[PDB]
Design a protein around this ligand. Sequence first.
Ligand SMILES: CCc1cccc(CC)c1NC(=O)c1nn(C)c2c1CCc1cnc(Nc3ccc(N4CCN(C)CC4)cc3OC)nc1-2
Length: 266
Amino acid sequence: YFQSMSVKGRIYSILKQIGSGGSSKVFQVLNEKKQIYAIKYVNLEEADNQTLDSYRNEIAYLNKLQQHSDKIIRLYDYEITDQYIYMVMEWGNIDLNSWLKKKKSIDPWERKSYWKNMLEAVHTIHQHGIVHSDLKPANFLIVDGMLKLIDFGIANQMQPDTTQVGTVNYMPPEAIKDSKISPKSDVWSLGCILYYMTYGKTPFQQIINQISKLHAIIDPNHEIEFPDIPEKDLQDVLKCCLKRDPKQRISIPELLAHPYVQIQTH
Ligand SMILES: CCc1cccc(CC)c1NC(=O)c1nn(C)c2c1CCc1cnc(Nc3ccc(N4CCN(C)CC4)cc3OC)nc1-2
């Protein structure tokens, strides 16, 4: 029940575990001033040089980029050694994958406000050359009704083995047809998340067969349902995000000047 750890001399008191993946554990902890944080611990015992440089790189970027937007998660401090990495981060109520897994109805205002957070955070990483290229709702954390981007998909996702889960619902068609990596790949994946918040599922979610789903994502003859809704700006945004051709698909800077994001509906 009572557990503890240090990170750069400062003592944190572990309350519980709030995450896991590969050889990393996220804990909900309290510092000496009874302030709540999330420490991500990562193990390097069997991680190769590539893997380690991927973690070092991600860290450096996350640290740098938090200044540039407040829609990226705070990395308050970290402790990096040959054996492990602690990262003392901003603690959030719940991730968006779990939040949307609760709710059927999402408040139009809340959806738009989330959409904006997502655009801003993702735009920031793009501005420093980073395409995420694996954006899911899992990647976004709700901190006081504000969505923070948890990670940049820079680090190499090593598997547990002794014991969200590689889902292709958010996968852009260019990725499925196999070096080059367009920032508009992320626009598709964001579009898929918004499509979820708009219509209740991802566009190819109803496709039960895996190989079929992949095929459907690419097949231009295979249309996507955009059932008409009061928010016609929302319907517009989704159609523009989910163009299969990356060159015809809308840009982040464009999505930011879009009526959905700018026009005040009251
Ligand atoms: C997707 C990002 C990623 C990439 C690579 C490696 C990792 C580490 C496993 C990660 N994961 C994280 O870096 C991470 N995952 N979570 C859940 C958090 C982080 C870092 C920051 C952070 C801050 N605050 C929270 N709070 C929180 C979130 C979710 C939940 N849950 C519990 C499990 N349920 C199934 C869903 C709801 C509980 C939380 O705390 C109360 N949660 C978090």
